[PDB]
Ligand binder design. Sequence first.
Ligand SMILES: Cn1ccc2c(=O)n(CC3(O)CCN(C(=O)[C@@H]4CCN(Cc5ccc(-c6cncnc6)s5)C[C@H]4c4ccccc4)CC3)cnc21
Length: 327
Amino acid sequence: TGYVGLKNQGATCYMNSLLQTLFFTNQLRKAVYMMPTEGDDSSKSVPLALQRVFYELQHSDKPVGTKKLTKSFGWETLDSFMQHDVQELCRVLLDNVENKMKGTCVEGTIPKLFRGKMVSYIQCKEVDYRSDRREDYYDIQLSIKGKKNIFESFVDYVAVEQLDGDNKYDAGEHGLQEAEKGVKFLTLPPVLHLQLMRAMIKINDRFEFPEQLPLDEFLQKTDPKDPANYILHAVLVHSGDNHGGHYVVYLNPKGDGKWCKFDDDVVSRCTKEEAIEHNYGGCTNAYMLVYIRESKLSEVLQAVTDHDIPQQLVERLQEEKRIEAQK
Ligand SMILES: Cn1ccc2c(=O)n(CC3(O)CCN(C(=O)[C@@H]4CCN(Cc5ccc(-c6cncnc6)s5)C[C@H]4c4ccccc4)CC3)cnc21
């Protein structure tokens, strides 16, 4: 493979999976590396540790440890990983970073990759009154129960729900009213992060998902020049229950369909089938997926030299490692 794993140090559960996912979001890696940790707290600055882990992921001939990162953002209780959803952790990281990049050349990168926009609306049936509010999303949580595939999800997601009888809409000046509330995508980000709502006690129901995911039709306008076809990039996987769970991520880091299994420290080549159909579920199955828009693929997954790291940085981390000298 050439790729190196991450250490299992405690119960980070999904963290390692998420870390790889992100570390192979190449345009974000370059961006992270650029972040100025020149005068940062070596111990408690998250943005620093995300440089360290990525550095070591790109250079370590041994499996990369994460203790310092888990410290930097301070999920150090007996349940602090299993009490949170995965996008929550993503947001933690992607926040700390997106900030540190403000007033830099690399400002605006996290949203440029992971942010898309939306409209939630409420429209009265009989009377004239509409409520349209736009929001930004960085990630999307699909309902799987009763859904066989990703399509049915995105159609469930844009389902124009009805508000009648015991739950009519307080239209204010118009009083309680019958109206329909839905959602509608305006855009979708280069990087499309999806979580499948398996927590409820874990649902293990079969939920199919494609390698190629056309999304133009859930948009309101489409783009002839830029269609919204997506390339499955990673598949975050879990298997077990409230007693024994275990986390694994499958990636094809180059968008070429050459898949790899990442079981923490152990990384191996695997089949398309192992990554995809074998994680449809029906107990060991996908809980989050990552998808790059086809057009932006080459950029997002731009390759990364060792000359894309500043020396200043490079030097600090090494001293820090060397000085890791124990008796
Ligand atoms: C809003 N919503 C609804 C569902 C859902 C979701 O599944 N996700 C994905 C998820 O965030 C679920 C939680 N999660 C976990 O890893 C779970 C954390 C819960 N874990 C079970 C437990 C083990 C130990 C537990 C425990 C509880 N109390 C004290 N000590 C240990 S609870 C089982 C894990 C699980 C993994 C894959 C799918 C579904 C769940 C990350 C993946 C994100 N958002 C969601």
